[PDB]
Design an enzyme around this catalytic site. Structure first.
Site, short mmCIF file in Angstrom:
data_model
loop_
_atom_site.label_atom_id
_atom_site.label_comp_id
_atom_site.label_asym_id
_atom_site.label_seq_id
_atom_site.Cartn_x
_atom_site.Cartn_y
_atom_site.Cartn_z
N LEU A 274 -1.47 -7.59 -3.25
CA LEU A 274 -1.71 -7.94 -1.85
C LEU A 274 -0.77 -9.06 -1.37
O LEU A 274 -0.28 -9.86 -2.18
CB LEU A 274 -3.17 -8.35 -1.63
N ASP A 275 -0.53 -9.09 -0.06
CA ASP A 275 0.33 -10.09 0.58
C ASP A 275 -0.30 -11.49 0.61
O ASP A 275 -1.50 -11.64 0.36
CB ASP A 275 0.71 -9.64 2.00
N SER A 276 0.51 -12.50 0.94
CA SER A 276 0.09 -13.91 0.99
C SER A 276 -1.02 -14.19 2.01
O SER A 276 -1.88 -15.05 1.78
CB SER A 276 1.29 -14.81 1.27
N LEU A 277 -0.99 -13.46 3.13
CA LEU A 277 -2.01 -13.57 4.18
C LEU A 277 -3.13 -12.53 4.03
O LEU A 277 -4.27 -12.78 4.45
CB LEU A 277 -1.37 -13.44 5.57
N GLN B 245 -4.38 -11.17 1.08
CA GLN B 245 -5.25 -11.45 -0.07
C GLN B 245 -6.35 -12.47 0.25
O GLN B 245 -7.50 -12.30 -0.15
CB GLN B 245 -4.44 -11.92 -1.27
#
Ligand SMILES: NC(=O)c1ccc[n+]([C@@H]2O[C@H](COP(=O)([O-])OP(=O)(O)OC[C@H]3O[C@@H](n4cnc5c(N)ncnc54)[C@H](OP(=O)(O)O)[C@@H]3O)[C@@H](O)[C@H]2O)c1
Ligand code: SF4
Ligand code: SF4
Ligand code: SF4
Lengths: 147, 75, 88, 296, 106, 111, 206, 176
Positions: free
Chosen positions: B35-38, B40
């Site tokens: 998943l991405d930084s934002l 997740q």
């Protein structure tokens, strides 16, 4: 046969008698629209009544300049209007942006928001020339609903 | 705490853009799940509303795994 | 007849509504204190209503002290409205 | 019983032909010309407004809650037209056992007309302004009952026919000098739009302007009279109409000449200032039949 | 008698004398080498001599104000706030900040 | 240092996280209070595509200015402001929309 | 000269005393450049401290300004530092007009003038609107002259006069007023610039 | 300069207090205010009905645009692009080509009424006096297309107003 044609003109005479416009103070044009109230040039109780009101009025005069902020604002007023509605674009700004036009904020034409039936070309639209806009509206109403 | 892991796993698996069987227990949401930084951290925000506790910005950075999230949920 | 006179006005009033309907085809609790005082004053008016129709057979000296008495207390109720009514 | 229709149809015409008076007399006050294009002097315009609004103009309701909105104009027009029945005139239609009690009752129920209109709209935006309009009418009805009683306690019972007979030589304006000033102001509270202002929408105009004539006539009974003459009905009919018309000019005088008093300071003119004044005169009018013999 | 402004015209003498003597001490706390102390002091001392010489005369109020004592008192009231802000933030005493890039002509 | 902006490098990233939560909670609220328009799920997908274009991060100076702007154009709904389903609408409704290809764009002939 | 000259210089030397008086304090923190021409004074200020300059001129024994009324900003892409926020100040007791300028690029935040001047906050919103300059420690930074669904900053010389989102149709959708349409009528770009230099002394050597 | 708006206590003692109280007890000044409109009602109103009577004007007035011509035929407009650049609305467009042989006078000449804020600048910038602003009021259309003026033609159709223009310009040379 003869009664059908004559009764249609009688309903059209009711709008030829009186027209209630919307008092939009969105312009320098609006000060000339206040000159319609000024005794020297009057359509007041000749046809025009300055009571306005968003719902009861039959005519709405789009006075001059319209921005993108007022573009959704003037549209919802038009929806509140009754079915026999006539829109007068008094002033060069209302016709297609007299000044500005190529500017970012000013909406060009007014017809991109609200459809127009009678166009008045004048920047300071002289009250003499403004008297045509109402008189032409009364003349334009000729025949409605044949069948 | 008893009966805390079952409540968090039911809400996490039901949510969109997540594997129902491939990722469960101890595995990180940003490292193992994918998943991405934002994206997740956004899944952790939805779990906070269901449990009934507001999570600060400082504690949200450290938490990633559901096993680690169960310890942080206790107050 | 009173019944015939009243019903004729309402039946013609209902007919005017149908003309427009059928033919064409294509917060703040400070207001409450004003409303309550209306009711409480009108009841004192209701007690002071008989005066022109009542004072015909009864003794005047017995009535004079009692007739003014209701209006005095009606002013005392307004005197309590001066000791901070509000912004209204 | 045909006379009831001879007191609705010419009355509905009187509310219609007001549109001439309400902007030509108001016009010369503002140095503008009123109706002129439509008729010879604009006499065709009042009937032309009826053809415009009734037949062709369609409806667009906000929510239309089953019975309401299509019930509020019935209460508006019905209560305004029923007020004509107890009126004394030269001769009244079906004279009530007590006159003025029927007059105050149908006016107090006429508050509902502006109440049901506030309930018709689903939005909270309209009802706050609607309740404010109720407050303009509900408050002045307290004093309206008091000033009525002071005139009655001077002479006559509640019957409106007896009020004409008591004014034989002199008008009631002279004995009730501060009370006559009150009836010029208190009547304007009932949706006249002079001291304070807030299809079926057109029907409210036919009801609100009807009350304006009603208050003009009712002031010309309580304070005006001049002569009675039972043998000659000709002399009374002409003389009554001129007196009522002069009061109609004064109703349109306040609408043009004077700005709005604010809603908050409307409750400073009345209640704070008028209610102590009216009751003090009511105290005075209790003593008057006792000090000097004055009982009907 | 009352002034046109919202500030009430109160008959108070020596009130101007207290505030003008207070500000002189504040200036002699942190800045000494700076020109801000050296220039403001001689204007205030010139104004204080006019108050001592003229006893409650309108001509004393007319000197460098001409809007009564109420306007002159406002000039002294914000003077203490201006002196304290100048003492807190170093600008008059120290000058070491970087110079602007070479461009000015349009 | 110069210039301050609001946060230094790592602190600026967590300011976006706080901004993301505030806007994620408003998209279900701006259906009943505002209008139905499209969908609650489709409105949340509009959020993710907006942050993807902004995703670069080279200096905290650029990031901090995006937070202030993010607390304005996405704030045009929280404190109840007039738009009437015309303002604050980001997605094109009448878009053609054009594609980037040497066969699709060249057939229409542009530039 | 009778009609050629507007006014002879007499107060120019009197106003030049202000050009010395504020410069006699001599801060590198504040002063920098002092320009005086046509009965007017112009000062530009170092970005680090703008509030201490604005607390000065406010009150003060020698000169009483108080009113920090009108607030402008200059967009210029010639310099390495872009924007130039210009304060226009007026005195009622003293009767004089002085100018306060900022030299910084101010894409990075600048100190606000709200604690010193009350009406300054409304002008500060306009600078954030048209130019895009953020003010630090500002109360209520809200859009005024820009649209609610407007992208970028409407004044900047980097983008055209027409813009990107400007035309608003109605057409197919019953209620939604359109936005993504970009085309407008052709604004004729005039290339009218006269050969030969207009005025001497203004010429700068390359 | 000072004028003072404040009355500074009009009432002092006995006589000055009672009359200031009398206007607030009853009305008086409202009845005095009633008399202001009363006399205003009787005096004749200055009203002009448009289809029969006409309002006052001037020798120099700007309305709808019309281009003039010489007394012995020939279009007076010389094609300069002078009026094009002065135009603050950019309503006027001009593209010029040689007329048959020798003469060079216009081809494209459109003046937008969707634009144009009415200055008389194009009247002033014109050295040959082609666009002269005539006393015009009557202009009302159904569309923008019908409103915006075409390649001369309708502007040349201003012959019906050119008789007035020739009279008005006689009050224009050596200004007023
Ligand atoms: N949802 C559906 O109902 C549906 C389902 C499947 C397919 N369709 C198709 O989609 C179309 C839907 O159109 P619609 O029903 O929305 O159109 P419509 O509302 O009936 O409008 C047609 C207009 O054309 C005018 N007109 C047509 N024939 C005329 C004639 N002979 N003389 C004079 N005027 C005439 C009418 O004007 P006047 O009223 O003044 O005469 C009318 O205003 C249909 O053609 C149908 O084949 C519809
Ligand atoms: S047309 Fe002229 S008068 Fe009318 S709004 Fe535009 S600029 Fe003002
Ligand atoms: S109108 Fe006059 S200025 Fe314009 S192109 Fe024609 S001759 Fe030249
Ligand atoms: S009057 Fe002004 S705006 Fe109109 S065409 Fe002439 S120069 Fe252009």
């Amino acid at each position: 046969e003869y009664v059908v044609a004559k009764l249609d003109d009688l309903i059209n005479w009711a709008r030829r008698s009186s027209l209630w416009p919307m008092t939009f103070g969105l312009a320098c044009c609006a000060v000339e629209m206040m000159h319609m109230a000024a005794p020297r040039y009057d359509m007041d109780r000749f046809g025009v009544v300055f009571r306005a009101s968003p719902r009861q009025s039959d005519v709405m005069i789009v006075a001059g300049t319209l921005t993108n902020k007022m573009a959704p604002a003037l549209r919802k007023v038009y929806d509140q209007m009754p079915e026999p509605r006539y829109v007068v674009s008094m002033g060069s700004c209302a016709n297609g942006g007299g000044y500005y036009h190529y500017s970012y904020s000013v909406v060009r034409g007014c017809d991109r928001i609200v459809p127009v039936d009678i166009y008045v070309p004048g920047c300071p639209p002289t009250a003499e020339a403004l008297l045509y806009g109402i008189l032409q509206l009364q003349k334009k109403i000729k025949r409605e609903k044949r069948l | 705490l008893e009966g805390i892991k079952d409540r968090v796993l039911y809400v996490l698996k039901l949510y969109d853009k997540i594997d129902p069987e491939k990722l469960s227990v101890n595995s990180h949401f940003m490292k193992d799940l994918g998943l991405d930084s934002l994206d997740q951290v956004e899944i952790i925000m939805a779990m906070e509303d269901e449990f009934g506790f507001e999570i600060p910005d400082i504690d949200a950075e450290k938490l990633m795994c559901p096993q680690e999230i169960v310890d942080y949920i206790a107050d | 007849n009173l019944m015939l006179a009243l019903l004729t006005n309402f039946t013609l009033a209902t007919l005017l509504v149908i003309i427009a309907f059928w033919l064409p085809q294509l917060f703040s609790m400070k207001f409450f204190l004003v409303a309550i005082t209306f009711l409480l004053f009108d009841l004192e008016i209701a007690l002071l209503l008989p005066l022109p129709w009542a004072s015909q057979t009864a003794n005047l000296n017995t009535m004079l002290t009692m007739a003014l008495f209701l209006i005095i207390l009606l002013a005392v109720s307004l005197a309590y409205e001066w000791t901070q009514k509000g912004l209204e | 019983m045909i006379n009831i229709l001879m007191l609705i149809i010419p009355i509905l015409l009187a509310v219609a032909f007001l549109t001439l008076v309400e902007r030509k007399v108001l016009g010369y006050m503002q140095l503008r010309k009123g109706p002129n294009v439509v008729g010879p002097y604009g006499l065709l315009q009042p009937i032309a407004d009826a053809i415009k609004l009734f037949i062709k103009e369609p409806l667009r309701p906000a929510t239309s809650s089953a019975s309401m909105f299509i019930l509020a104009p019935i209460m508006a027009l019905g209560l305004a037209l029923t007020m004509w029945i107890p009126l004394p005139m030269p001769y009244p239609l079906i004279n009530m056992n007590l006159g003025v009690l029927f007059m105050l009752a149908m006016s107090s129920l006429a508050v509902y007309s502006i109440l049901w209109s506030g309930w018709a709209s689903n939005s909270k935006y309209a009802l706050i302004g609607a309740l404010r309009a109720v407050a303009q009418t509900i408050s002045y009805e307290v004093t309206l009952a008091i000033i009525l009683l002071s005139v009655l306690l001077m002479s006559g019972s509640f019957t409106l026919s007896t009020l004409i007979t008591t004014q034989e030589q002199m008008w009631l304006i002279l004995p009730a000098w501060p009370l006559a000033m009150m009836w010029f102001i208190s009547t304007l509270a009932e949706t006249n739009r002079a001291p304070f202002d807030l299809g079926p929408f057109a029907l409210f105009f036919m009801a609100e302007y009807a009350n304006i004539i009603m208050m003009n006539i009712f002031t010309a009974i309580l304070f005006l009279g001049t002569s009675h003459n039972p043998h000659m009905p000709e002399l009374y009919t002409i003389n009554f109409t001129i007196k009522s018309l002069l009061l109609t000019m004064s109703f349109l005088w306040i609408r043009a000449s004077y700005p709005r008093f604010r809603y908050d300071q409307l409750m400073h003119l009345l209640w704070k200032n008028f209610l102590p004044l009216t009751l003090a005169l009511c105290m005075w009018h209790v003593s008057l039949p006792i000090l000097t013999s004055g009982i009907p | 008698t009352g002034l046109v402004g919202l500030a009430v015209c109160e008959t108070p003498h020596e009130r101007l004398k207290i505030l003008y003597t207070k500000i002189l001490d504040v200036l002699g706390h942190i800045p000494k080498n700076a020109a801000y102390r050296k220039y403001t002091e001689q204007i205030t001392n010139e104004k204080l001599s006019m108050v001592k010489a003229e006893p409650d005369v309108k001509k004393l109020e007319e000197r460098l104000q001409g809007g009564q004592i109420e306007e002159v008192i406002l000039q002294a009231e914000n003077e203490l706030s201006l002196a304290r802000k100048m003492i807190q933030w170093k600008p008059w005493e120290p000058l070491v900040e970087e110079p602007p890039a070479s461009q000015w002509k349009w | 240092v110069k210039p301050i902006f609001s946060r230094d490098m790592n602190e600026a990233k967590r300011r976006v996280r706080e901004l993301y939560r505030a806007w994620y909670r408003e998209v279900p609220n701006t259906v009943h209070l505002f209008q139905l328009d499209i969908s609650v799920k489709q409105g949340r997908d509009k959020v993710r595509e907006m942050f993807k274009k902004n995703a670069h991060i080279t200096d905290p100076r650029v990031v901090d200015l995006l937070v202030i702007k993010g607390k304005m154009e996405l704030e045009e709904t929280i404190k109840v402001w007039k738009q009437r389903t015309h303002v604050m609408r980001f997605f094109h409704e009448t878009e053609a929309p054009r594609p980037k290809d040497f066969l699709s764009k060249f057939y229409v002939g542009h530039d | 000269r009778p009609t050629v000259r507007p006014r002879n210089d007499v107060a120019h030397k009197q106003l030049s005393a202000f050009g010395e008086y504020v410069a006699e304090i001599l801060p590198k923190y504040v002063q920098q450049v002092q320009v005086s021409c046509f009965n007017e004074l112009e000062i530009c200020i170092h970005p680090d401290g703008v509030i201490p300059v604005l607390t000065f001129l406010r009150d003060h024994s020698n000169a009483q300004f108080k009113s920090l009324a009108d607030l402008t900003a200059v967009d210029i892409p010639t310099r390495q530092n872009r924007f130039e926020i210009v304060y226009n100040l007026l005195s009622l007791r003293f009767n004089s007009r002085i100018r306060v300028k900022t030299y910084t690029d101010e894409l990075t935040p600048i100190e606000s003038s709200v604690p010193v001047y009350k009406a300054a906050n409304w002008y500060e919103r306009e600078i954030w609107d048209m130019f895009g300059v953020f003010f630090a420690n500002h109360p209520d930074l809200r859009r005024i002259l820009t649209d609610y669904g407007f992208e970028g900053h409407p004044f900047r010389k980097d983008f055209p006069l027409s813009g990107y989102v400007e035309l608003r149709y109605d057409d197919e959708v019953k209620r939604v007023v359109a936005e993504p349409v970009e085309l407008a009528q052709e604004f004729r770009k005039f290339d009218l610039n006269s050969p030969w230099e207009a005025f001497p002394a203004y010429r700068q050597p390359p | 300069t000072y004028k003072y708006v404040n009355l500074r206590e009009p009432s002092m003692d006995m006589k000055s207090v009672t009359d200031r109280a009398a206007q607030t007890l009853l009305w008086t000044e409202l009845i005095r205010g009633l008399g202001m409109t009363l006399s205003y009602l009787f005096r004749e109103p200055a009203t002009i009905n448009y289809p029969f009577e006409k309002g006052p004007l001037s020798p120099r007035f700007r309305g709808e645009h019309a281009l003039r011509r010489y007394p012995s035929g020939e279009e007076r407009c010389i094609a300069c692009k002078l009026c094009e650049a002065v135009c603050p609305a950019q309503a006027i467009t001009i593209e010029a080509e040689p007329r048959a042989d020798g003469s060079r006078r216009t081809t494209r000449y459109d003046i937008d009424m969707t634009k144009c804020i009415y200055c008389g600048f194009c009247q002033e910038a014109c050295p040959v006096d082609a666009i002269v602003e005539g006393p015009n009021f009557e202009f009302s259309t159904e569309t923008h297309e019908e409103l915006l003026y075409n390649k001369e033609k309708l502007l040349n159709n201003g012959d019906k107003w050119e008789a007035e223009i020739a009279a008005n310009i006689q009050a224009d040379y050596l200004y007023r």
